Each structure stands twice: as structure tokens, then as C-alpha cells.
Amino acid sequence: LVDTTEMYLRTIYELEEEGVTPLRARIAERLEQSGPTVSQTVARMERDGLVVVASDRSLQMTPTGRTLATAVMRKHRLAERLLTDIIGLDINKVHDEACRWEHVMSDEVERRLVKVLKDVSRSPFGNPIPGLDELGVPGTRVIDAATSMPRKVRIVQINEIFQVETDQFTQLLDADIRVGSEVEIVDRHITLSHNGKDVELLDDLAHTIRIEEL
Amino acid sequence: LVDTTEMYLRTIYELEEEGVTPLRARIAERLEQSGPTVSQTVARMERDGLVVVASDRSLQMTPTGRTLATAVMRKHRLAERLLTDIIGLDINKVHDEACRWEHVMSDEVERRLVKVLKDVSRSPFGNPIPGLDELGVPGTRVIDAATSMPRKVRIVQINEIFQVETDQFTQLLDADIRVGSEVEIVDRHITLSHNGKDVELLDDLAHTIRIEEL
Ligand SMILES: [Co+2]
Ligand SMILES: [Co+2]
């Protein structure tokens, strides 16, 4: 369930955000894991293309690693908003609770939260919620888305242109368808448707276309 | 985060509830784990006093194992009610989502859910939510609770008776305280307170006381 890689990744993002250089000792401390352990985990994250240890001994997240981190931070902060706004959990406990929820929330649940919550621009602790765009807010495709169933759606775208073829365209136209538208678608081929118608477608367309869603 | 022991325990509870004999092969199947793996996990759960393999090759949960299982089932079902009633997540996805949330929800979050939800007597799938009493509804203590812071708471118771011582008572008464009451507490010793016053305490008371919460 809890992927430890996601834990390291959101910790680099967090430090980076506070304007701190994400060096291994700071990460070991915040994570409360010995230097040797973080050293081995970073070695396998490099092999996975998630991070690179920069010329200056700091950790630079690769495009893919940054994308993973962002989604974890978005889940974390959407969870905090849900916990304070709707649930009424004591503010002194919101953060630690969200630290666990961030690992099990599906994107489908996030899409729904953006709808039921009135304001998803910042966390209760004053930091902006990242990656809402990646959520349609090219894508986606358707294829993827578608579934079967149917559905429806738307567408856105377609483309056409591319284509080739055409044829268808026309067819577508016729139917118508376209773108826106719505449608439806578925697957079954695928287808678508428307018107009715249907357509278917092819493939291419378917693939492409785308668507877204619604 | 996810304790595998909690996974085995809620699976025994579930079968038991459907009027099925919780034999190891059924559990291996539902869990989609080979017979040898469940065999080793059950061996360590016995050592931990969570279960006993009955004279007829079925698994009998010990008082402590039953208490753990119940809390996991209560979390699971409170999560489902939250997901359908408030969040509006597609009914075809509620169950699998809750299967993960059940492992990270704190009792403090449950106490709040019993307040914000209108009806916590059954899950959307027609089964009663167990252990609400254990929640003040012996515890716790305070111590534990307490824390530192302060707180407050308440208471319940205281016781006283026881114581021894006383012284214181017175113181307480014075213051016043008681129971119921408320208170506060814390721690710082512790204390408580109331009125104013304070107381412181012691231890025892513280322890015891218780408380619760508120
Ligand atoms: Co936080
Ligand atoms: Co369920």
C-alpha cells in the first residue's frame, strides 16, 4: 500500500518547497531513517529513474519522479481539506492523518473532492495544492479510459492531424462526435456512442482521441 | 501502514459473517495468496495469540483477534458511508477504496464520522457497522487519555469502590467532579480541572477514572 518511494519523493518535494536543499541527511532526519538506509533507498530510486544525486550532493527529482511527488502532495493536501472542512478533525491531528491517506487515495476520489470542496487552492497550513490540472481542474486516451461498463465522458481532442486513415472522419461527423461532445464510451472493440449512433473505432483513433471526465 | 495481519483478520470476520467456515483455502483464495503463504502467516498469528486453528481445521479468532478485526471492519464501513454519502464516489468503486482506507483511519477520525454522518447503522452494501460502542456510540483511563494539551473531556466513572486511599474523594467533591462532569484533563502529574479548581490526581486514581470524549 504505502510505497516507501512515494515517501521519499514527497519529502524531497516538501524540502524543495520550503526552500531547503534536499540533501540526504535532511531527508534521513525528516524521515527518521538512518543515513545508511536512505543511502540504499536513494540508490534504487536512481536505478528506477526517479532521482539523480546532483553534482553538489543534493537530490534532483527527474521529470517522472517530480510528477509522482506532485500527485502524492496533491492527495495529501486534498485529504487535509477534507479532514478539516467536512470531517472536523482536530487541526493538531490533520497533518499526520493525511500523511497516511496520501498513499491510499485514488485519483477518482480526488476528482470527487474537487467538486464537493469549496476551495481547493491551498492546504489548511497555507501551501498551494499542486497538480489540479493533472486532474482536469488533453485528458486521457480513450484506449486507456475505456472500461467494460458503458461510461459517459466528454471529448477533449480527436487528433485528426495525426491520422493516416481517414475513413472514420465522416463517420464521426455523422454521429456529431466532435470535441466538446458528451459521448458514452466502452471497451468491448472500443465504441463511442452519441446521438443514438455507435462508432466502433480503429486502433489508431482509439489510441489518439482524448476524453475528460464529467 | 497496511498490517497484513489486519488483512487476514478482517477476511476471517467477513467469511464468518457470510456464514462461511473460515478454512485456510478460502482465505487464500479471497486474499489471492498461495496456500503456503497463508500457512506461514497463520502460524505467526497463532504465535501472536490472534487466532487458533480449531480441531476441525477452521480458524477461530481469539478474543483479542476478534477485537482487532471488528475495528478494521468498522473503519472499512464508516469509510464506505463517507465515500457514498458525502464524497459521491461511484458505488462500483466504494468497496475497493475502503479496503485500503480501513488500514489508515484513526479512531479519532471515526468519532468525527459518527457525528457528521446521518446513519451509521449499516454499510451501503447492507451489512451492519460493528463496534460503535467501542467508540462511545466505561471509556478510557484518564492515565492513557491525558495528553500535554489541556483537553476537555467527560467523566464516565470514578471507581471509588476500588480505591484504597480515599483522601482525594472530598477534594473531588469540593471541585464538583463527579461522573457526568465535563472536566479538562492534561498530563504534566495528571490534573483534572472543573469549576476553576484543579485536582492533581494520585496514580491509583489516575489509573482508574474513566472518561469519554465530547
Ligand atoms: Co500536511
Ligand atoms: Co466493503
Side-chain angles (χ1 to χ4, degrees), chain A residues 2-6 8-44 46-56 58-60 62-72 74-98 100-104 106-117 119-139 145-146 150 175 180 196 206, chain B residues 2-6 8-44 46-56 58-60 62-72 74-98 100-104 106-117 119-139 145-146 150 175 180 196 206:
Chain A
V2 168
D3 204 354
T4 64
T5 288
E6 288 192 344
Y8 281 64
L9 285 176
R10 61 105 63 226
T11 304
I12 292 165
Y13 189 104
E14 190 187 32
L15 296 183
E16 201 172 74
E17 190 174 48
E18 302 168 358
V20 176
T21 309
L23 305 154
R24 288 157 299 169
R26 292 293 301 254
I27 292 154
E29 178 184 51
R30 190 160 298 184
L31 286 187
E32 297 197 298
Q33 294 294 99
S34 69
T37 291
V38 320
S39 180
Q40 73 178 5
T41 305
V42 164
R44 87 123 183 302
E46 273 201 303
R47 282 176 247 130
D48 292 340
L50 297 169
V51 87
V52 82
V53 184
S55 55
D56 65 322
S58 68
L59 299 181
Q60 268 195 323
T62 63
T64 303
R66 178 163 305 271
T67 291
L68 255 290
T70 297
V72 180
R74 186 186 63 212
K75 294 173 192 293
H76 177 76
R77 294 179 177 162
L78 248 10
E80 294 185 322
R81 284 261 65 105
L82 161 68
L83 290 159
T84 67
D85 300 352
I86 305 300
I87 301 176
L89 178 73
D90 177 32
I91 195 61
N92 293 306
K93 295 174 176 132
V94 164
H95 182 74
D96 292 319
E97 189 83 28
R100 289 180 239 124
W101 287 34
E102 67 183 20
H103 300 293
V104 303
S106 63
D107 306 345
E108 309 88 77
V109 165
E110 295 183 88
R111 298 184 199 107
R112 294 302 311 165
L113 285 175
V114 173
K115 287 173 190 303
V116 313
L117 295 171
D119 187 65
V120 293
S121 59
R122 301 174 165 307
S123 71
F125 304 110
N127 293 302
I129 299 192
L132 298 165
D133 42 281
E134 294 281 295
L135 217 66
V137 188
Chain B
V2 168
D3 204 354
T4 64
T5 288
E6 288 192 344
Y8 281 64
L9 285 176
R10 61 105 63 226
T11 304
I12 292 165
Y13 189 104
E14 190 187 32
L15 296 183
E16 201 172 74
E17 190 174 48
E18 302 168 358
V20 176
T21 310
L23 305 154
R24 288 157 299 169
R26 292 293 301 254
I27 292 154
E29 178 184 51
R30 190 160 298 184
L31 286 187
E32 297 197 298
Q33 294 294 99
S34 69
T37 291
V38 320
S39 180
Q40 73 178 5
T41 305
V42 164
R44 87 123 183 302
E46 273 201 303
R47 282 176 247 130
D48 292 340
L50 297 169
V51 87
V52 82
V53 184
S55 55
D56 65 322
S58 68
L59 299 181
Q60 268 195 323
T62 63
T64 303
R66 178 163 305 271
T67 291
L68 255 290
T70 297
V72 180
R74 186 186 63 212
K75 294 173 192 293
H76 177 76
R77 294 179 177 162
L78 248 10
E80 294 185 322
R81 284 261 65 105
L82 161 68
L83 290 159
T84 67
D85 300 352
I86 305 300
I87 301 176
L89 178 73
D90 177 32
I91 195 61
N92 293 306
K93 295 174 176 132
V94 164
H95 182 74
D96 292 319
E97 189 83 28
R100 289 180 239 124
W101 287 34
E102 67 183 20
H103 300 293
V104 303
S106 63
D107 306 345
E108 309 88 77
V109 165
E110 295 183 88
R111 298 184 199 107
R112 294 302 311 165
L113 285 175
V114 173
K115 287 173 190 303
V116 313
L117 295 171
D119 187 65
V120 293
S121 59
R122 301 174 165 307
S123 71
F125 304 110
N127 293 302
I129 299 192
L132 298 165
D133 42 281
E134 294 281 295
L135 217 66
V137 188

